Amino acid sequence: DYDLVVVGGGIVGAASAREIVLRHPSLKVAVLEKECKLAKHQSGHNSGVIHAGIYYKPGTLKARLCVEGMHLAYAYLDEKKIPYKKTGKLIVATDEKEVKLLKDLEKRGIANNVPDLRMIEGSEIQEIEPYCQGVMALHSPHTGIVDWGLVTEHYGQDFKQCGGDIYLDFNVSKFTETYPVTIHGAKPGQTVRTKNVLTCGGLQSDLLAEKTGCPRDPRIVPFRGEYLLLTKEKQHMVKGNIYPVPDPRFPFLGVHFTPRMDGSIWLGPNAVLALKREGYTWGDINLFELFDALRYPGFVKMASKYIGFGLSEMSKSWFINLQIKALQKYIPDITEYDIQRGPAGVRAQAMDLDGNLVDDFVFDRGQALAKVLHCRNAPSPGATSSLAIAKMIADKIENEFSI
Amino acid sequence: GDYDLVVVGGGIVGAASAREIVLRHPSLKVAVLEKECKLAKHQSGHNSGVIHAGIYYPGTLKARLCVEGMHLAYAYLDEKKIPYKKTGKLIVATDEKEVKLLKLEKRGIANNVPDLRMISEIQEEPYCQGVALHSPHTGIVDWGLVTEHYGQDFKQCGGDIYLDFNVSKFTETDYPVTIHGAKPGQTVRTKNVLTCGGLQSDLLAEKTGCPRDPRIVPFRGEYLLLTKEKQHMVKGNIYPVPDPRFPFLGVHFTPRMDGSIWLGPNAVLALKREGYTWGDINLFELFDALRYPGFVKMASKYIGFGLSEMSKSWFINLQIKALQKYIPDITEYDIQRGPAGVRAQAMDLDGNLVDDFVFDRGQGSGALAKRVLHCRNAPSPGATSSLAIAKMIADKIENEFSIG
Amino acid sequence: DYDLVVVGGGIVGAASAREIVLRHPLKVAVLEKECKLAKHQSGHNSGVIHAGIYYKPGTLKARLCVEGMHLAYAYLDEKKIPYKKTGKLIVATDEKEVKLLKDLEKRGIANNVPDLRMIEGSEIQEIEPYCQGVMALHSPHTGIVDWGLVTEHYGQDFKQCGGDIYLDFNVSKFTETTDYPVTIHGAKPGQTVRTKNVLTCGGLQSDLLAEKTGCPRDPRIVPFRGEYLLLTKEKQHMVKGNIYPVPDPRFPFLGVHFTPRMDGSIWLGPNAVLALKREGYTWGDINLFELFDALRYPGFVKMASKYIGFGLSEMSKSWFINLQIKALQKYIPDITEYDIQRGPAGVRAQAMDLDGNLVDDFVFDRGQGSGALAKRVLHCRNAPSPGATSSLAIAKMIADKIENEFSI
Amino acid sequence: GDYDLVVVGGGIVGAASAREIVLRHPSLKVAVLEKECKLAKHQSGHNSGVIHAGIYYKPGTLKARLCVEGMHLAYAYLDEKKIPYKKTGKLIVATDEKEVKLLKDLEKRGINNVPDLRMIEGSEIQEIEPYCQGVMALHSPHTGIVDWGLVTEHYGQDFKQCGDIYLDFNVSKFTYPTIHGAKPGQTVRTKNLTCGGLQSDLLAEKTGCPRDPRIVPFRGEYLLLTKEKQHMVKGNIYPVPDPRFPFLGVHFTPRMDGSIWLGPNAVLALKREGYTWGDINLFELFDALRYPGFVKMASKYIGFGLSEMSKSWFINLQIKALQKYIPDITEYDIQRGPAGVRAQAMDLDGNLVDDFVFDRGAKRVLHCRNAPSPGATSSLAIAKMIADKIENESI
Ligand SMILES: Cc1cc2nc3c(=O)[nH]c(=O)nc-3n(C[C@H](O)[C@H](O)[C@H](O)COP(=O)(O)OP(=O)(O)OC[C@H]3O[C@@H](n4cnc5c(N)ncnc54)[C@H](O)[C@@H]3O)c2cc1C
Ligand SMILES: Cc1cc2nc3c(=O)[nH]c(=O)nc-3n(C[C@H](O)[C@H](O)[C@H](O)COP(=O)(O)OP(=O)(O)OC[C@H]3O[C@@H](n4cnc5c(N)ncnc54)[C@H](O)[C@@H]3O)c2cc1C
Ligand SMILES: Cc1cc2nc3c(=O)[nH]c(=O)nc-3n(C[C@H](O)[C@H](O)[C@H](O)COP(=O)(O)OP(=O)(O)OC[C@H]3O[C@@H](n4cnc5c(N)ncnc54)[C@H](O)[C@@H]3O)c2cc1C
Ligand SMILES: Cc1cc2nc3c(=O)[nH]c(=O)nc-3n(C[C@H](O)[C@H](O)[C@H](O)COP(=O)(O)OP(=O)(O)OC[C@H]3O[C@@H](n4cnc5c(N)ncnc54)[C@H](O)[C@@H]3O)c2cc1C
Ligand SMILES: CCCCCCCCCCCCO[C@@H]1O[C@H](CO)[C@@H](O[C@H]2O[C@H](CO)[C@@H](O)[C@H](O)[C@H]2O)[C@H](O)[C@H]1O
Ligand SMILES: CCCCCCCCCCCCO[C@@H]1O[C@H](CO)[C@@H](O[C@H]2O[C@H](CO)[C@@H](O)[C@H](O)[C@H]2O)[C@H](O)[C@H]1O
Ligand SMILES: CCCCCCCCCCCCO[C@@H]1O[C@H](CO)[C@@H](O[C@H]2O[C@H](CO)[C@@H](O)[C@H](O)[C@H]2O)[C@H](O)[C@H]1O
Ligand SMILES: CCCCCCCCCCCCO[C@@H]1O[C@H](CO)[C@@H](O[C@H]2O[C@H](CO)[C@@H](O)[C@H](O)[C@H]2O)[C@H](O)[C@H]1O
């Protein structure tokens, strides 16, 4: 019924299916999503920041796609008239040990050609954020905030305006050979036949790849990202984004202060090991989803080296008074009575056999069903670089299937 | 939009109640809010699918609603032209004590289950044995499809079904109550509210002012699928003689409209409200069910019964020794594990399992109170008695909400 | 240093050591890890002296019981050890239990149990006026005793003939050095004992000690806690003797029985609950090393495949004692939950093969090869039930087994 | 009726008090009731055997008063009875400039009338420990190595030679107005204290004392350095610990037999006598976790306690911290050794008790629920304080 279908209604799958039919309008492209609407998981529960590209090492792939995607996104928001607020980004250092890291993020950010990056001292910190302390800060006024869930839906809008079809409530559960390939949903009779596919399963990147002939690695390890909602009384204390100086050994950016479109400013997210693939709450646990997460060889290797950082993140979440004490190192005007537990997101972090966290493209196919391409990982961050990542995925697909 | 009445629940009880209230009053502006993407996505979409004739329940309301609902169901199935098969039920006894309990025959004759005969005798079910009761008016149907037709009739009467509407907060506003969904900006204004939340009967009732009791204790009903190489060994429904102390009818043989033979369901306590799998655990929803005062009181009396259900689930080989008492030519190789349903069992603070109607509301004569009525439980079988209990739910809200 | 070492100060190890020194007046020592002898199974038992009623006629388990019973009474009177000889009344609950009790009557008189006599009706009131039932089986020769006190007398006779008892000696390792090739190391540093041959009756650790020589993991020791209930002193007059239920013949467990102790107390038990620890006498005692290994045993998965229902039954009645009372009221109905109290417990050293069966026979095992430790250290990994009553008979069997394995 | 005074607990505290009591009044009928077979089978038998100089303790405090006095009393007792010991330096070593500040406060608090407190510079470090690095350090040569289990046996040896140690006596309930044991018939009546280490809270509840202060077991795990490199550690090597906790941190310490133990750490034991990780007790966890003060301390000190468990789960991380002192140790050079359990008392607000705590019901009983640290070196000094409190409550 179709030529190629994209499995995944996330911002990556929507932007890829959009980009491929814009350049090739003669291709019947469909999209299968297991949920009611688009961007229900990662791209629907994010902090909503358009990143400038500072943390990523120059000359790498992630440093190029982020800077290119940040300009492609801003140009896309004006064409579609999507609301967005360009607020300041302050990477504030609190002691003499973090400014050395801040000085590395300084030279690393300038090499990526981020627009108008300045390094302010403690005197000018209140000039951008009057309520924030710090020894030194890094100001990136080009960063902005946007609802990536609305951005994801606008991708699907332009997708089917060119002839696409978005099949929502379609839980892909099996691939069969009959248009040679055939896709089967969770409901009986719900089936779609095509020639090739391209999956962007996000949190189920590996499980979709296990139903074609790909190995278990790289396994998707769920990391919950919890947020705290500051009360409306003190929303004026944060004008823009206030980021901390993170540990460069991990891709996590740490809990930060971030405003949103609805005037709400949120505190987060953290790095909490989710005991469930879609474990948005701490109580929700799946025994089968962690027996494999524990029997995975790479998990024991990462835990052998980085168990202390994951447990202290879980410590600051068990007792939020510890998290407040950390946030007071930046804005000491916030107490435990000025916040309340909000929603959270889960990160689909890839992991190899050695325990490293993957931050690179991971395409895989079977060893008819083989030669079905699975995008098991995309470079961070997937939201800002979405349009740039889409073009790169729109190049891998045309050589794997000859379009 | 603004409405007169709002029904929270896309199940067979919420849809039939919403369908009944608009047929009696076509001038009403009634809406339906369902948190899932389709009607009958839980209990009404994960059931055995057999239409009961009320042979186990006389003089009460459940025995009247089931037989009346069974007659109204066959009339609705023929009017809307929905496929159904009169498979017939065969309640077989095995031991000598089960013969005394089956002599269930007197209660079924009083309830006027038509063509009820005490049978064992012969295999005129060929492969079934044992030392029985036949009622050929018991049939099977897709109750999930029946629920969709209730929504089709409700939409044809001017009603709107809001899907993906996860009700999360009732606040005060001509339409003095407003309803908040999960997504920001999802708002519906109404005058009076009726909730049929099924597995979330108590949680929805808590957002108005109702007490914790009765609590909804999840009981997962796992099913085993007899493979196609032996589906011919069961022609109609073959039920065992159950313990009258529990509403669970025990693991039974039941054919489906697609020709498959399903074996079940059992009674395994789910570690989650929507725990359809054995491993899915919600520590919050688990601790509250156990810390509920009525749970330990019920566990102190019948935990051995629930443990044998779990043991037959952990080791399937123990389950077939029971099934071999009815059909001995079934091995461990002829069956596979299938899907499951979770029962919204209501339980009081004393431990007794609720089986009657439970309507609850607020207290202090406010706006959220008196205008939001919660159906915390409906008599079983809910699917078969759906058209029957919908008439009594419509009568309840007509009195409670004053409708013309 | 010594010619023979018997590790384990239980009733089986002390009887074998006492027997082996009387026949060969040999430098033999006894190593016990605990403070005193009979600190486990020999000191945490029902204290009943059985006659061969339940056991198969003509088998070794049935011969040893009546042989050890007659040897015990002769030994109790010889050493002036206090013992009370009441009766064991096995009552049937329903007609289905009358069929099993009829077989136990024929199975008991075949092994010469003096003197079996079936009773029924109002005759049950003549022996126990508070207990009911359809039919019963009377055994006037069944008595009670302090098996822990009996075990200490075995070591008393063992020391009265030149034997040395090593207390607080936790055997940790078996190494080789001659003339005494095998030395035995303890938990404390420097504590060592050299010997020519070693015999191990470790009870709950018979498989762990055998693993330190070269013996396989099977048969594994699976701990089964046996909890007791204390009948209040206000109703201890309601039971005059031993009231036993007819047990399932598939399991060696005799079932929760009414049993008086010689201090006047009436204990109701024991049950058969799986222990989360080899020496887990309480409900909360959990050792993850011993828990996560009893589950990884191949026989444990096979045994639970067929008898998990009987085990969860025992556990459910252990969590809610009201269920246990409803079972005991089928015999003496005037007992309620207010008339009981949680008491101490014992742990059975139940051996299990790889197929899941509970072995109840003699299991001797030595190391592999012609080395020093493999040919001089013999492990008794299981003894026939009951080890306490059959102690004198088991000791003679073990003594003959040692006389052949080591040529003394 | 048999004895006049009964000391429940045969640890180093119970043995020293019973020994001190009979020397003052040789006419008293005194007995010691120990649950285990030998004396010093628990806390006193499972320690680093260090005679503490007393450098961490604030001046003018009671803990600093008994430590400096008990250390001198212990050195006189070891020579009087000819007990083997070795006087090696402790050498408090620092790392970064942030650790030098706390090391400077340790030198000021010590100069508590500590003897011969010299501050090593850096090049002189190799003259005391040639394999240890660091920036600055604080030396004190009169610290000692000792078998505290051997000393406890000598305390009871004198007590038994001055007029009875009842071993295997698990004191159960209470009834010369009777002390019951675990075995039926095991009895002994007295006219007048308990010093149970990990059970001072449970013994007090047998006569009507409140649950507070509770005893929270903290397992102290040790690591045995390989015998092939048992020469890199000549004396003690202690890190600069966080002053908010009584734990001195994992340290290098040699034993009488030449072995060197690395530790102990502070890992929450899941059992009162939980000497290994897998040994847990559910009843003793609903005790500690449901305790009101435990949640208060956990809400403030969970991060430090979680990293301790992380270093215990993976020695991978533990040696990475030890290499900051001597960097010539690998993973194959270490091996998991034995451990001890700390009888840390905790009040209802979460604070860790560090002073004397005596509580009675009902009048003839007196439970020393806690004693100042370190109880091993302060054994003779603390015993003098316990003997003064029991004489007043009218010997
Ligand atoms: C807490 C959090 C905060 C973040 N904040 C930011 C930020 O501030 N800025 C930024 O640039 N990035 C941010 N990100 C990253 C960004 O959200 C993700 O990188 C991006 O959404 C990845 O796109 P995706 O489509 O792969 O994710 P997803 O949206 O999760 O894509 C997966 C989709 O596939 C569907 N699916 C899965 N399995 C199947 C199946 N079998 N059949 C059919 N459909 C299936 C899922 O339902 C889902 O819709 C954040 C991520 C997290 C977790
Ligand atoms: C395993 C099993 C087998 C059964 N077999 C039979 C049989 O053979 N024959 C028979 O007659 N009966 C049978 N039944 C009974 C029958 O299925 C139920 O009685 C019936 O489905 C009850 O109707 P309901 O509306 O409560 O269903 P439900 O679907 O459970 O109704 C609850 C609905 O409300 C929605 N909801 C909950 N909370 C919210 C919220 N906050 N906001 C919005 N929506 C919300 C849920 O998504 C759901 O759609 C069976 C039941 C079970 C569990
Ligand atoms: C609850 C219960 C009730 C019973 N009731 C009865 C009854 O009524 N009548 C009856 O006849 N029988 C009864 N028995 C059975 C009888 O008690 C046992 O069969 C018998 O006690 C076991 O003898 P043993 O010598 O093997 O025992 P144990 O006493 O268990 O012997 C093991 C000994 O080995 C020692 N040991 C272990 N490892 C080492 C080591 N490394 N170094 C040194 N020493 C070590 C232990 O300390 C211990 O003392 C009962 C058993 C139980 C559990
Ligand atoms: C890991 C660790 C390392 C240490 N290192 C050092 C060090 O280097 N230097 C230093 O000076 N100090 C050190 N200490 C401190 C010192 O070892 C202890 O503080 C000291 O032993 C406490 O004395 P105690 O008698 O109360 O202890 P314990 O020896 O525990 O005394 C309690 C005794 O009473 C018995 N008992 C308990 N309940 C009962 C009962 N009901 N009936 C009968 N008997 C009972 C117990 O069996 C035990 O023998 C260390 C402590 C620990 C835990
Ligand atoms: C499964 C077990 C293994 C777990 C896997 C490994 C997980 C690793 C997660 C690393 C921690 C998350 O990322 C971490 O966030 C914290 C908290 O914001 C940052 O912390 C930083 O900012 C916070 C406030 O925001 C300051 O109080 C803090 O002093 C500073 O270090 C770290 O710089 C960053 O490294
Ligand atoms: C607090 C939580 C603890 C659990 C609470 C109590 C839960 C009670 C569970 C009841 C068990 C389910 O319901 C029970 O099903 C079993 C097994 O199908 C039926 O059992 C019947 O049919 C089976 C075959 O299916 C026959 O082998 C059996 O001999 C017969 O009794 C029981 O008659 C019925 O009572
Ligand atoms: C870990 C997985 C495996 C679990 C282990 C399974 C072990 C098997 C358990 C056997 C149970 C103990 O042994 C069992 O005791 C019970 C209770 O006393 C006896 O039961 C008998 O007496 C009791 C009262 O005492 C009566 O209420 C009962 O009707 C009668 O049958 C059984 O006849 C006997 O079989
Ligand atoms: C129950 C949950 C809460 C747990 C309760 C609170 C437990 C508190 C324990 C704190 C940790 C133990 O004590 C802590 O030991 C560590 C490790 O040795 C010391 O750490 C010090 O020495 C180590 C080496 O040993 C160095 O690598 C480290 O850089 C240095 O800081 C800390 O200075 C001390 O504070």
Numbering used by the authors:
A (entry chain B): 42 to 219, 225 to 413, 417 to 420, 422 to 453
B (entry chain A): 41 to 97, 99 to 144, 146 to 161, 164 to 168, 170 to 176, 178 to 219, 224 to 454
C (entry chain D): 42 to 66, 68 to 219, 223 to 453
D (entry chain C): 41 to 151, 153 to 204, 206 to 217, 225 to 226, 228 to 242, 244 to 412, 419 to 450, 452 to 453
Paper passage:
Crystallization of dmL2HGDH in the absence of any ligands yielded crystals in FAD-bound form (dmL2HGDHFAD) and in complex with FAD and SO42− (dmL2HGDHFAD+SO4) in which SO42− was derived from the crystallization solution. Structures of dmL2HGDH in FAD-bound form and in complex with FAD and SO42− or 2-OG were determined at resolutions of 2.85 Å, 2.30 Å, and 2.82 Å, respectively. Structural comparison of dmL2HGDH in FAD-bound form and in complex with FAD and 2-OG shows that the 2-OG binding at the active site does not induce notable conformational changes of the residues involved in the FAD and ligand binding (RMSD of ∼0.37 Å for 412 aligned Cα atoms). In all structures, there are four dmL2HGDH monomers forming a tetramer in the asymmetric unit. The four monomers share almost identical conformation and are related by noncrystallographic 222 symmetry. In each monomer, there are an FAD bound at the active site and a detergent molecule n-dodecyl-β-d-maltopyranoside (DDM) on a surface groove. The FAD molecule is apparently derived from the expression system. In all structures, an FAD molecule is bound at the FAD-binding site, which adopts an elongated conformation with the isoalloxazine moiety pointing toward the substrate-binding site and forming extensive hydrophilic and hydrophobic interactions with the surrounding residues. On the si-face of the isoalloxazine moiety, the N5, O4, and N3 atoms form several hydrogen bonds with the main chains and side chains of Ser88 and Val90; on the re-face of the isoalloxazine moiety, the N3 atom forms hydrogen bonds with the side chain of His92. On the other hand, the A–B (or C–D) interface is mediated by both hydrophilic and hydrophobic interactions as well as a disulfide bond formed by two Cys77 residues.
l-2-hydroxyglutarate dehydrogenase (L2HGDH) is a mitochondrial membrane–associated metabolic enzyme, which catalyzes the oxidation of l-2-hydroxyglutarate (l-2-HG) to 2-oxoglutarate (2-OG). L2HGDH belongs to the d-amino acid oxidase (DAAO) family of the FAD-dependent proteins. Like other members of the DAAO family, dmL2HGDH is composed of the FAD-binding domain and the substrate-binding domain. The active site of dmL2HGDH is located at the interface of the FAD-binding domain and the substrate-binding domain and is composed of residues from both domains.
